[PDB]
Amino acid sequence: TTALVCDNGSGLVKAGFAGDDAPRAVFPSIVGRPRHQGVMVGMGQKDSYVGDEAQSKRGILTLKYPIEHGIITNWDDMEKIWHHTFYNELRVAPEEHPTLLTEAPLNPKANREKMTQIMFETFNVPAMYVAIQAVLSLYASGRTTGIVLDSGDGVTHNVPIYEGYALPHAIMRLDLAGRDLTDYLMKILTERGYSFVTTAEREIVRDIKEKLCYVALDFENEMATAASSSSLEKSYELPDGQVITIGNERFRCPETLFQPSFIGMESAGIHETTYNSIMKCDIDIRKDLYANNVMSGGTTMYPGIADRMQKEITALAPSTMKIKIIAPPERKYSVWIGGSILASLSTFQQMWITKQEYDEAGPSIVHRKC
Amino acid sequence: TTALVCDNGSGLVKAGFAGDDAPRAVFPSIVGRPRHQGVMVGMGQKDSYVGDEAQSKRGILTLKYPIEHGIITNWDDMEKIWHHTFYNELRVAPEEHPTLLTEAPLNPKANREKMTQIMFETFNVPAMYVAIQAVLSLYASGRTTGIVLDSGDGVTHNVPIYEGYALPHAIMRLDLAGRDLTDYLMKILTERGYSFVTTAEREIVRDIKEKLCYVALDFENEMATAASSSSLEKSYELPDGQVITIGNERFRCPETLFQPSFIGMESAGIHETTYNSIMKCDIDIRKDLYANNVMSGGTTMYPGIADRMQKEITALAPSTMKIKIIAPPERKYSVWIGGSILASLSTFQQMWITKQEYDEAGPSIVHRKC
Amino acid sequence: TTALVCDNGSGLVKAGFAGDDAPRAVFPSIVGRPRHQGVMVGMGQKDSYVGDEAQSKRGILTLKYPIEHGIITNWDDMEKIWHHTFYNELRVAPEEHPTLLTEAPLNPKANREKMTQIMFETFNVPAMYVAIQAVLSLYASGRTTGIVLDSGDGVTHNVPIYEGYALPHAIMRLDLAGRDLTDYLMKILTERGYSFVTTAEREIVRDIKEKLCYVALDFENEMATAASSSSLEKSYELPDGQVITIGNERFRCPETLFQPSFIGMESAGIHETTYNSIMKCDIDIRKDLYANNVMSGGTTMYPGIADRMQKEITALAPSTMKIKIIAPPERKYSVWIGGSILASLSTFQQMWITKQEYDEAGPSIVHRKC
Amino acid sequence: SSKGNDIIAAAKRMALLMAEMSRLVRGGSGTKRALIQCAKDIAKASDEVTRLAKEVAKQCTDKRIRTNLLQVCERIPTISTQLKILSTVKATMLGRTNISDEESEQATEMLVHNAQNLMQSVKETVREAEAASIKIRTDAGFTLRWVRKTP
Ligand SMILES: Nc1ncnc2c1ncn2[C@@H]1O[C@H](COP(=O)(O)OP(=O)(O)O)[C@@H](O)[C@H]1O
Ligand SMILES: Nc1ncnc2c1ncn2[C@@H]1O[C@H](COP(=O)(O)OP(=O)(O)O)[C@@H](O)[C@H]1O
Ligand SMILES: Nc1ncnc2c1ncn2[C@@H]1O[C@H](COP(=O)(O)OP(=O)(O)O)[C@@H](O)[C@H]1O
Ligand SMILES: [Mg+2]
Ligand SMILES: [Mg+2]
Ligand SMILES: [Mg+2]
């Protein structure tokens, strides 16, 4: 048989088989339910849509994400997504495949115990294991040493690793990611007269964010350039045929990662959170962490995010150090690719949590093993 | 047993059986009573005429319609038309057939409650159901998605439907239809010296409307064309034997669907009512509504109505969408044809209002089901 | 000289002088134009009516509101209302008075740049300033701390303020107010057989809304009470002399504020919008916001709106906090009264935008100050 | 496991009748009477799919599969009924004299789109029935047991 690698993100589900180089199923992690009146007989009887069919029929549905900031909040809608990615997307039975799941650090412990109970008592997997998402991004980089910055849809976290040893006192976590930049771009698009208030219109602004937004190298130079010129303007066409024009909100939306006061948060930016995680580590390993800054996740895919991170960390580093940011083109699947490496190691098959190990310890076995 | 489909419109009754391709009985929805002196013994003793009996003897009768603007105003006359379409037209017994009825949206609730009381306590049907006319026009086109323009003799209404879901906040209704065009054509025929005043002469101007009237593509071109030449002139022969000649009133009569201010109404045209009902819908379903503009009813049977509708909505659309008006040649019976589709569905037979259910809830059961 | 305070609402204009206790001029924000034929020589040649004279001659006029949803859409008609409220209503010259204007939050920035240009280049005021409407509703309550709920004719917005500091990430805005309840009441009056379609008939249903409507404390009990009893019925006399009778639509029209699904919106009610705006704020200031719930504007004037807001927020609050809704009897003018407090402050006199500052920086100076 | 692979062959007979109907729309006015006969048996071939996709729902014990399968298969008794009645209406409208070249041009698109909508509704019940075969197979034995690899 073959191990399954499921990466349940806050915004996307990346599932597939252990050993491959790309996930087989990549679909949104939403559940849509209809909100209008089904006047035609026979057609309107489906109660909920899950994967890409909730995204195509989204004009008549209420879209809900079951995961907010890495924490599963809707446990009934989460089982619909897990039943969809097994039977409808991968088309495998879960009884014949061990499943590798992921999680962010500094989550509640009831989140990791309930997804262990659901996997063993609803889908009846033979074995399972929960891993940390920033450890798996280091497997997908050709490295055993470096500090990972993983920014997805709900969580941004830093993990320093030196020669396979993590330093858990220096692990940072910041609840600001791609869902909070979509909500901020919706707020500053009202300054031009565009109003997106529906949850189906939130999926439209997420498409404007992924195509027209970038990270400015100097924020105050671009704010003065956009006021004097009109070369920073771009156009996007809505699903009904209307054309909107944004020129200033292209770089003001991902500046919230570097200035989180734009949404009323007191936290420091992702350049200062990284530097504070290095300076919490020991002085003899700091030189090998400055030269290995692995960026992972989907929110690290803006144009200019890695040249801005190099400019801001060099201004904090002691100026004889060599700053280098590793940002591969497959950043969006680093947690999946390194998760398929880990499930393929011959050493790893003594580290699964089997089902008969689960019967004497209950769901508390996932804390003593993972 | 076979279900009955009865489409009580404001001008015509379309009755038949569930499953056929055309209504069996189509007759005017009038009731005529004599207005003269019955000097010959034995002959002149009938007191009321209903179907084509009143359309044939109309020279000695006063014709009256029990339905205006989609609302039944005379309830003693509407029982005569229902008794005529059962025993004399279809020649069936109403106790052995469930009857499907239709109604316009945004109608009074006392209109729907009284027509279940007449059907259950005077004609004693085993079951019944009241359907919306613009939903049944979508069944008769092979679609489950599109905005319907139903325009008959009293009501013009728009209903948007996407994948079997109606959006009832975007449903429009305009009380301007083929009877308000007959009354306007009677008024502008006084400019040529033709006086039609009685209710029997109203049925003659309805034949001039159905034969010589069309919709101009641009109203201001043909208003100068008809003053330059006499090529738009046409002749009609009255039942007396006289010949009238109309040249300018051919396109000025159906123009008041697009400019309702010709009869003193503040409402917008049928092209702006269609566009405003699309713009009340959600932005993701607007593209599939522009491409499916189903036209229904007998007032949409003018020569040139569908090319004028394509010109006017394209001028309001955002110029990237494609507009398409579906106007089949069976437009006059699309409410009936879709009504015979619905009563033939095996899913529909759990949706009837049986007489056992009516005895427990009274006439308020028709609002919970239909 | 005395400063002018003009509160341009979506439905009503409230103008007056800074320092007083009530606005001097309160008139509808409409512009009426004739739709019929002026057959008598000399009389019918006025082409536009503005204030209360468009409301009195409304039977021969087409009424237009130049502001919907808080945004000025007709700029030729908006200068007619400003020229009416200066010369004809207040009887002052605009060159000798600085003018305080208001605006809703999250509004387009071209709306505030154009109304600065109209004041400085058409009416030639010496100075001006634009203030947020919910900040002015806190001045008029004797408080410096509390979350404001302002609901007028186009916009319903929440603003939290603690000791004079606003939290702009927690400011809400919902485009549902008293004009969207007039249209919904017009739609559910068709169930009783009453049809109001004209824009002049829209002003009649607005008087029915302001006189017979109230907010039910428990909605599902009143929906069962009105079906069993007949004590909830009331009568209203139309200007023609007819009498209508509504019993169920009295509490179903203002329930759209608490269930916005009734008009096809996905948003939450004003009790959940208020609670979500409190929970976006910091935990140390949440106790002083539960105890100060300031209601403002004309849509908060239903009988029972404040006892219903207390029941619904208490069901969401953590049950050891005390909820107190402050709803003064002068709620309709609290944005004006707080605007006359602010324009009378000696601290404020250095915060006007003078006309010489406008010539140096153009219309973009209104964002650097207000 | 014998009525699980019956659905694929039943839904592949409809794929041949759709491709047969797609060839008849290129020809002129002579081949449109065979177009209506090609639409009156797609609606009958779709009745075979809903006859035995109900039988798979009586076999599956997982309630999230057996209720998701019946919610998607009930469109096929609806679009088939309005395809065999719309074909009867178009079979009568050709009996008129001198209709147009454009009137009958758009009358076939009301039968093609009604049949493309039926074919797109029957491929989405094969997907929820192929997901039912995974649950039927493991509850009747046929399960590969996983064993942990020894170092
Ligand atoms: N090209 C892009 N530019 C900016 N943001 C992007 C881009 N592509 C995806 N995103 C964002 O990435 C997020 C999802 O990335 P991912 O790491 O897969 O999330 P998760 O780990 O939560 O599943 C979304 O918020 C999406 O908007
Ligand atoms: N060819 C035609 N051109 C214009 N109007 C027509 C034509 N045929 C019928 N009408 C009008 O259609 C109306 C009746 O259409 P129909 O929709 O069947 O009636 P109902 O009001 O009962 O739904 C009448 O007012 C009649 O004048
Ligand atoms: N007593 C009342 N009950 C309910 N609604 C009212 C009442 N008085 C006024 N309104 C509504 O208040 C709205 C205007 O309120 P107001 O705040 O003065 O307007 P704006 O803020 O738009 O200038 C109108 O839509 C009107 O119908
Ligand atoms: Mg992730
Ligand atoms: Mg009709
Ligand atoms: Mg106001």
Residue numbers in the entry:
A (entry chain C), B (entry chain E), C (entry chain D): 5 to 374
D (entry chain M): 981 to 1131
Direct quotes from the study:
As optimizing the density of fully-decorated, well-separated individual filaments in cryo-EM images is a major bottleneck for single-particle analysis of F-actin-ABP complexes, we chose to use the ABD of the vinculin splice variant metavinculin for these studies, where a 68 amino-acid insert displaces the H1 helix and replaces it with helix H1’, producing a protein which retains actin binding but completely loses actin bundling activity. Previous studies have suggested these isoforms engage an essentially identical site on the F-actin surface with equivalent affinity, and we further found the metavinculin ABD lacks force-activated actin-binding activity in our TIRF assay, validating its use in these studies. Using the Iterative Helical Real Space Reconstruction (IHRSR) approach as implemented in Relion 3.0, we obtained reconstructions of the metavinculin ABD (residues 879–1134)–F-actin complex (left) at 2.9 Å overall resolution and the α-catenin ABD (residues 664–906)–F-actin complex (right) at 3.2 Å overall resolution. Consistent with our previous medium-resolution structural studies, we find the metavinculin ABD undergoes substantial conformational remodeling upon F-actin engagement, characterized by displacement of helix H1’ from the 5-helix bundle to license a rearrangement of helices H2–H5 to relieve clashes with F-actin. N-terminal residues 879–980 are not visible in the map (transparent brown), and are presumably disordered in the actin-bound state, while residues 981–985 (brown) undergo a slight rearrangement, extending helix H2 by 1.5 turns (five residues). The CTE is released from its pre-bound position, extending helix H5 by two turns (six residues), then undergoing an approximately 60° swing to engage a site along actin subdomain one proximal to H5. Metavinculin H5 extension is facilitated by binding interactions with Actin I, notably a hydrophobic interaction between metavinculin I1114 and Actin Y91, and a salt bridge between metavinculin R1117 and actin E100.
Our studies focus on the homologous adhesion proteins α-catenin and vinculin, which are major ABP components found in adherens junctions (α-catenin and vinculin) and focal adhesions (vinculin) that are critical for the force-dependent strengthening of cellular adhesion and mechanotransduction. Approximately 3 Å resolution cryo-EM structures of both proteins bound to F-actin (to our knowledge, the highest-resolution structures of ABP-F-actin complexes reported to date) reveal they share an overlapping major actin-binding site. Next, we compared the metavinculin ABD-F-actin and α-catenin ABD-F-actin structures, confirming previous low- and moderate-resolution studies that both ABDs engage a major site spanning the longitudinal interface of 2 actin protomers, which we term Actin I and Actin II (numbered from the plus end of the filament).
